[PDB]
Structure to design on (1448 residues):
């Protein structure tokens, strides 16, 4: 039966948002089966802001290339593949796409140590505009996260190391509708904040019970160590992509996580790499750097403008969003030596999630 | 007579916040008459028209003149004031106050070599000289003079050379036209000529190799330009066996945009014994880092395409990245991170970085 | 006694270029002791942390103090210094030097009404006051005081009210927390504009409450131009009006910019100030216009003449708004040294309408 | 045979919003086979790496090809697609759809002259040709060809010439080893072909330094690697069946509205200083190029427009505010922001297309 999952990740460069050359070659060479693709996680060149059309262009170009390789119309990929493009690739970040596959096999290969990577996906019930940034969004995301854990065959939340949530944002047209029906409305960071909390609820990090509309954009004590949330568009359907480990994984990869303690801290990144399975003290050898397949780091602006006792400009800077990612990228790439890293963030808030996927090889 | 150089790093919350700078003198901690340089990072764009940078300069000069009890004018040959604009990300704006006194006695038990400061001034650099061989020669002479002022003869003991030169203005280019002369094209012509001057003076580049057509390396030049002052200025940081200073300087070369080995080499050759990472005690031995993060020579990094040369905010991002690398090693946000110019100092895609670290008696 | 107000517009090549400013006094053209306001545009970002703006402020204060022969600290209550940062496109950085003296006799043959300046200061505005009803009341009182200082009783004769107020800092929040209080820039600005509206009888005071402050666009002042920052708990009001007993050789007028491409507000300002023209100004008429003070806040919607615009989404929206406002004003007056402020998000004029005021020559 | 050119201006809410564009064809209002140019403004930076601009190009081509029922590859010589990125302030992103049919009969009562469109292609422009005399010559030949395509012999009847050329990449340089230069060379090519600049005056040395050599009507851009230069030319002709006429003017400085007004006036609107609402609606489109000025002195005063880091964006913001303040129409083609051979020192070209109705 569809019994053991085998997830893989292939990281391929993009020279522009619409450069799918090396992405298409992955399928055309028979290296990867397009039907087994479950997620595309990408960095694009551009502003990274709410109206970054270059980000949308990469999304459209990647969907089109994948649909062509699968031989379907693009309109099919819509529920079957998570496509997550984070805009803004400053400094050392090389734009790319991480192609995530998963197949299920009937038998577990021999000699795979410890736990291994597994992917789960889930979808929310429709989130109405009067739900956005409020307790209904939290509950609905939490259910989709529970569903993604179930899809991955994972029951222990401690084995979940990264949860990507894509939700809807408000538009004047959605407001128009709540308004029609007699409803008030709250928008991107509300949605993002509600989603992260949903993750926390579903992973048992925050009791439910503690949730209410008035805690949502406020009580920083309530948090998920592993949520990475974004919003936009109008799709009332929330989407969850969940990366975990399981003892029964056939995958040749393992995931781990850490928490970036402040804006100059490398210990979160290192912890991610270490708990994913690389045994190292302070720095990675070249061989160990190459064990690291991908890093997914979310570099939200810090909660204060005080860093190691000193004033910094990171909250005042008009280019703050761009700088946060520039810094996060420099930190990750200085450790791993790999410019094609998933560095997202730059939203307003001091700890940030980072996850690392590393090779897990048979004995 | 023995030089004793010191450095005091103090924070600035804005370009005109000289509170903690003035306290240094008012507390008797530091003698304002011994100040030979102010090296500062200000908040702002870091571009050619960054008025916040000029504001810090003016505020720092005014505060120093007041502490010395002189008018601000009387300070203009005697102190190098170098403000680099643009303090993205982890860079905390600040001023490094550099002092030097000469003492009659060399304290006992100071290991190896020690920090020494030298300063120099060029003969006037005409607008037809900018970016051309004349600027090179004139900077080289000012660097030689700064070595002589520091009592240093060995160029291998020079670890950082800051040059401030003039840039073209429309009125300068009017003047050269007046006298029947062409101008070169501009801040970066000046900067490139200056770096080469440093190289010539340190024996890094033979002079016969210089001509206007080569002008677009020194491992240790950190050059900038602007204004109209025809007088070039040189600030030189070195070591000497006869230094009374409780500090030592070292340098390295940043190999590419993600490399930390240049920074680490700077710290290590300055005197900190470490393998890969610094302990907290060792991080606190590092008093200041002076890193220049010019954009790289190509858009290929570890075999992959990067956006750093195409980005409209490239100048700001270069410093953001450089700052992140330095501060991730030293834990000290008040670091001197300059740069963001387009890519003649350092090897190709290579950037200079210097570190000043404690040198304590036995 | 009869007020005599004047305005002299001088260029600045940088935020610390006070050359042409100092020449005004050194040439005997203007008496520095009679300066009551400096209204300036500086080069820079125009954002909350625009240090180039502060640099112009400090430079202008220092030059003025030196010309007066006082320490710079004396000019703190006696002169309004208002520097708006951000001079995109056709806007030439400059300082408008506003003077006022009072004379014992009213010259003959001055037509209609004439310019008068008034100033006021608020009682201290605590951080728990910012963006709330207390700020409104305190600004309103300072506006009433400025009218009284100008000798003006009719709000219809008031054509421009500049308010500078405090903004929140973490350190102010800390204080209000310390005393068991909550807190809440645009809040401050919105509360100030409403204060102006209250004091000019444009909005009845019963309509005011903390919940309306930033939400009910129906409450607005046609002539408020508000800003905030720093920590100075003292609000400041500079008020430009006319009066039948003015000895000034200038008159002020105002208009409302109807949308982002509209020139009729600017033209109405110029026309009601006294220039008689149908659609476009001759060169002689353009030179009658001494200064324009236009506030170009972002619009309330992204729909302009039935089409979508990017002005609310643009990361550079603040800068673009001023670029556009400046282009409109300068295309009419031909004078790049115009006071174009704004770029805040959209209580100041009607839905998305923007105030503009014009000062023009009024000759015997 | 008589040309009948038309223009339909439709909004875009995003670079990939082709909804109103597709409705034009689906409603039978416009025949997609008659489309000869798409001239568009997109939201984005307007800089060399503006991918949003490329996105609009791709989206528009794909929509048009779908409406024609061909593969997108077949539009590649038959339709000029020109997207200028950067839509600050009052500029509403949109596409001007330009059609042209040739008809057997010339309608009665069409006053004066009327709009006609011509197109041309250069021979391949090698990278060693870019910014040099070869690019000039090759562009000039393509402009002569576009005139011939439009049936126009009098350069005075040409009011707008858009040239798209290649820019350099490290990979093109590599080959020759075996942007503004390109734009400058192209403008000069236009000038040569329209008789505005004698060809003996051209040399690699004058290109981008002798400002005395200029075209009043060139609007040039570059990018990509396509060695093929493209020319789109808008003119009038006495034998036009078109219900439109084009005119042009020169913007004298950054705050000047007289160039815009001259464009509208010479295109056929009779007005003194300001347009009535009826007259504003006669103006179908304006194509204005707002290159940064040659100096930082404006009406005797210093401006920041050359020093500003956002200069390119601001120039268009200003140009757009001027155009829209006259016409009341946010969907206007405002390009530019390059550093300052499109027009006199300090001067910028602007063209206007206005209604020309039967008697």
């Amino acid at each position: 039966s569809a019994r053991y999952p085998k997830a893989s990740m292939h990281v391929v460069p993009m020279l522009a948002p619409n450069d799918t050359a090396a992405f298409r070659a992955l399928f055309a060479s028979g290296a990867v089966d397009p039907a087994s693709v479950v997620a595309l996680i990408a960095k694009s060149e551009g502003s990274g802001l709410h109206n970054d059309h270059a980000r949308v262009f990469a999304d459209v170009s990647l969907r089109t290339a994948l649909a062509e390789a699968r031989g379907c119309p693009v309109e099919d990929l819509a529920d079957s593949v998570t496509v997550a493009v984070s805009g803004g690739s400053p400094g050392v970040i090389s734009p790319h796409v991480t192609v995530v596959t998963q197949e299920w096999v009937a038998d577990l290969p021999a000699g795979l140590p410890g736990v291994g990577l597994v992917v789960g996906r889930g979808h929310t019930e429709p989130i109405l505009p009067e739900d956005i940034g409020r307790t209904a969004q939290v509950d609905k995301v939490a259910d989709a996260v529970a569903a993604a854990m179930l899809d991955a065959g994972v029951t222990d939340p401690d084995d979940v190391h990264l949860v990507m949530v894509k939700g809807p944002a408000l538009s004047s047209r959605a407001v128009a509708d709540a308004l029609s029906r007699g409803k008030t409305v709250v928008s991107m960071c509300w949605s993002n904040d509600a989603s992260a909390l949903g993750v926390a609820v579903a992973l048992g990090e925050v009791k439910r019970d503690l949730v209410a509309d008035d805690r949502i954009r406020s009580d920083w004590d309530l948090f998920s160590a592993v949520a990475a949330t974004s919003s936009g568009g109008e799709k009332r359907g929330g989407e969850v992509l969940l990366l975990a480990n399981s003892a029964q994984s056939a995958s040749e990869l393992r995931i781990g996580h850490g928490i970036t303690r402040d804006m100059a801290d490398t210990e979160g990144i290192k912890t991610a790499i270490r708990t994913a399975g690389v045994d190292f003290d302070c720095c990675l050898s070249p061989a160990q750097q190459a064990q690291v397949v991908q890093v997914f780091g979310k570099f939200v602006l810090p909660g204060s403008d005080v860093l190691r006792g000193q004033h910094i400009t990171a909250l005042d800077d008009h280019e703050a969003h761009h700088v946060a990612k520039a810094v996060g990228g420099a930190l990750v790439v200085s450790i791993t030596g790999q410019p094609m890293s998933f560095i997202s963030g730059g939203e307003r808030n001091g700890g940030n999630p980072v996850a690392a996927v590393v090779r897990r090889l048979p004995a």
Remarks:
- The first helix of chain B runs from residue 19 to 26.
